[PDB]
Amino acid sequence: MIIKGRAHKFGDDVDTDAIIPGPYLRTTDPYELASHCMAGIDENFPKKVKEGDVIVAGENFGCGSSREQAVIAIKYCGIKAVIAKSFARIFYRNAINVGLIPIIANTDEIKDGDIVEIDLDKEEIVITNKNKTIKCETPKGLEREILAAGGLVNYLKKRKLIQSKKG
Amino acid sequence: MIIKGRAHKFGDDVDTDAIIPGPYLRTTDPYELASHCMAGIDENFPKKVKEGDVIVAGENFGCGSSREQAVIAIKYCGIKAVIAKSFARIFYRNAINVGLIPIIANTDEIKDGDIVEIDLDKEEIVITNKNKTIKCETPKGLEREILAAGGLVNYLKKRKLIQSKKG
Numbered sequence: 001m002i003i004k005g006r007a008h009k010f011g012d013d014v015d016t017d018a019i020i021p022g023p024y025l026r027t028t029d030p031y032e033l034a035s036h037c038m039a040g041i042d043e044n045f046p047k048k049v050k051e052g053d054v055i056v057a058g059e060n061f062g063c064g065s066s067r068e069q070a071v072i073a074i075k076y077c078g079i080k081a082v083i084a085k086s087f088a089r090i091f092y093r094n095a096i097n098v099g100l101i102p103i104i105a106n107t108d109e110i111k112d113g114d115i116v117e118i119d120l121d122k123e124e125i126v127i128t129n130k131n132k133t134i135k136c137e138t139p140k141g142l143e144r145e146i147l148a149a150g151g152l153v154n155y156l157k158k159r160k161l162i163q164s165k166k167g
Numbered sequence: 168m169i170i171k172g173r174a175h176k177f178g179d180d181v182d183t184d185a186i187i188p189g190p191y192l193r194t195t196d197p198y199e200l201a202s203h204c205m206a207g208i209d210e211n212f213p214k215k216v217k218e219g220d221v222i223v224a225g226e227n228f229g230c231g232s233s234r235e236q237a238v239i240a241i242k243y244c245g246i247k248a249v250i251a252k253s254f255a256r257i258f259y260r261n262a263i264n265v266g267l268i269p270i271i272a273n274t275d276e277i278k279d280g281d282i283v284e285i286d287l288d289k290e291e292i293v294i295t296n297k298n299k300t301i302k303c304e305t306p307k308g309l310e311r312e313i314l315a316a317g318g319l320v321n322y323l324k325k326r327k328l329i330q331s332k333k334g
């Protein structure tokens with residue numbers, strides 16, 4: 001599949017608090033969380049982002065705390081993927097489990113406002129307004145399957161469903 | 168935003184039964200419904216469709232019965248939009264209410280398997296593999312707002328949320 005949208009570029013070490021400040025963690029509504037996505041470093045993000053857009057960052061994106069809210073804040077902004085040079089281990093796992101696609105690439109090649117086209121099958125990112133394409137690395141194995149199902153929950157109910165018609 | 172994927176082309180008068188045969192209506196799981204999307208005319212659709220793809224049809228798509236399951240079957244296949252020459256009135260309404268985007272265009276310009284790029288802001292559909300772009304008509308007014316919120320439910324809770332912080 002192909003994910004195409006506007007890129008919102010950030011730097012290195014964008015941690016969970018920058019993604020979704022601790023004080024907002026006192027809410028249930030995921031959309032409530034989404035309304036403050038990236039508010040830690042860019043108070044204008046929630047008002048600029050559009051469904052289908054992509055967050056682009058530097059090294060160690062999602063750094064810090066084991067917050068499922070961080071990935072939920074991103075996912076509920078209508079963002080299907082995050083492109084970064086590297087991802088904090090815990091964030092990566094949480095992203096996979098909620099259906100948020102973590103993509104690895106040299107983000108120095110991407111500028112804020114660029115229109116990017118991520119082709120998950122070819123594992124390339126076309127930066128349409130810059131007439132260039134860069135390679136990327138998408139999730140594989142189990143993580144790819146969980147992502148394909150849209151998250152851990154779906155993956156598990158599809159596993160049960162199969163077992164259902166098994167007898 | 169931009170929706171880009173592979174087009175699955177169908178003809179005129181594709182009714183709700185073709186979209187989701189009556190016998191399957193005895194289920195709760197939307198994914199269960201999705202597994203038989205378009206099974207009425209193409210038993211291979213469920214196995215060919217990929218998240219991000221687009222259904223393209225002729226006149227009067229969604230014809231017939233007031234089945235919310237038809238739009239749910241499409242939406243749960245990972246299909247965000249349906250491009251047709253015209254839409255049955257009831258289907259159109261149901262689509263809007265679940266966040267499925269009904270787009271009007273001369274689909275004779277689109278062939279099965281074409282890669283299409285729907286730009287909702289420019290109201291154009293780029294048929295990338297055919298080096299051509301055609302105009303389309305996207306939803307406006309209230310319908311556009313409901314769609315933007317992702318469905319009637321979200322639209323309503325966003326209306327309440329606003330009222331909440333009002334006093």
Ligand SMILES: [Zn+2]
Nearest residue numbers: 013015063064
């Ligand atoms: Zn850090």
Ligand SMILES: [Zn+2]
Nearest residue numbers: 180182230231
């Ligand atoms: Zn009919």
